Write a protein that binds this ligand. Structure first.
Ligand code: HEC
Ligand code: HEC
Ligand code: HEC
Ligand code: HEC
Length: 91
């Protein structure tokens, strides 16, 4: 069955893996800290991730409830040059 990223994570730690008491915060800071607690920091990631260190939280790209496992974010919501992850990773 198609699984969202939120659901995939919840199978290995519950909704509380990312949300205090399984309940979302208003400003997403708690959740961003959880993402980084397992995955590390943007500055230690690849070329798509690094420039966003200090500017974005993970959820500004990864819409974990809306996106399938496997589905990755695109760039057009914030950049107007047609860039893709491919165009940046394999620059
Ligand atoms: C981390 C991989 C997550 C897991 C596991 C689950 N959710 Fe989540 N959810 C996550 C983020 C980054 C956000 C947005 C930021 C925020 O502040 O939370 C969300 C959002 C939701 C929402 C919407 C909140 C809003 O519209 O005000 C809800 C209701 C929500 N999440 C519920 C929820 C449940 C019930 C989960 C377990 C099945 C669950 N989330 C897991 C990240 C993650
Ligand atoms: C530890 C308890 C975690 C928290 C909190 C979050 N993630 Fe996670 N994530 C974790 C594991 C062990 C895995 C599986 C290994 C893998 O890399 O696949 C994942 C996976 C993802 C993925 C998929 C990566 C891929 O294989 O293509 C994404 C994109 C991802 N996680 C994002 C992410 C975000 C945005 C989180 C906070 C909202 C988050 N994870 C929390 C472990 C943990
Ligand atoms: C938009 C600018 C993003 C932000 C902010 C974060 N991620 Fe991301 N992530 C994005 C894309 C387009 C992709 C696919 C291309 C790639 O660079 O690999 C990813 C991929 C991941 C993965 C898998 C990496 C792999 O080698 O397979 C993980 C686990 C992941 N992203 C996690 C993650 C976390 C935890 C973030 C906040 C610290 C985060 N990403 C931010 C786009 C974007
Ligand atoms: C808004 C939520 C964003 C999304 C989606 C993506 N990026 Fe981004 N990017 C964002 C900010 C706030 C910044 C800081 C500099 C700026 O443009 O104002 C960046 C920066 C980059 C850069 C550095 C070079 C530059 O254009 O400034 C790269 C290489 C970059 N962003 C790549 C990139 C890719 C590949 C994305 C889609 C996966 C992507 N960004 C999404 C904000 C946002």
């Amino acid at each position: 069955a198609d699984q969202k990223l939120s659901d995939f994570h919840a199978e290995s730690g519950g909704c509380e893996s990312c949300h205090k008491d399984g309940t979302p915060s208003a400003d997403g800071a708690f959740e961003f800290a959880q993402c980084q607690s397992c995955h590390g920091k943007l500055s230690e990631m690849d070329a798509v991730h690094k420039p966003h260190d200090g500017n974005l939280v993970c959820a500004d790209c990864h819409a974990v409830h809306d996106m399938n496992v496997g589905q990755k974010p695109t760039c057009e919501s914030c950049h107007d040059d047609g860039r893709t992850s491919a165009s940046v990773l394999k620059k």
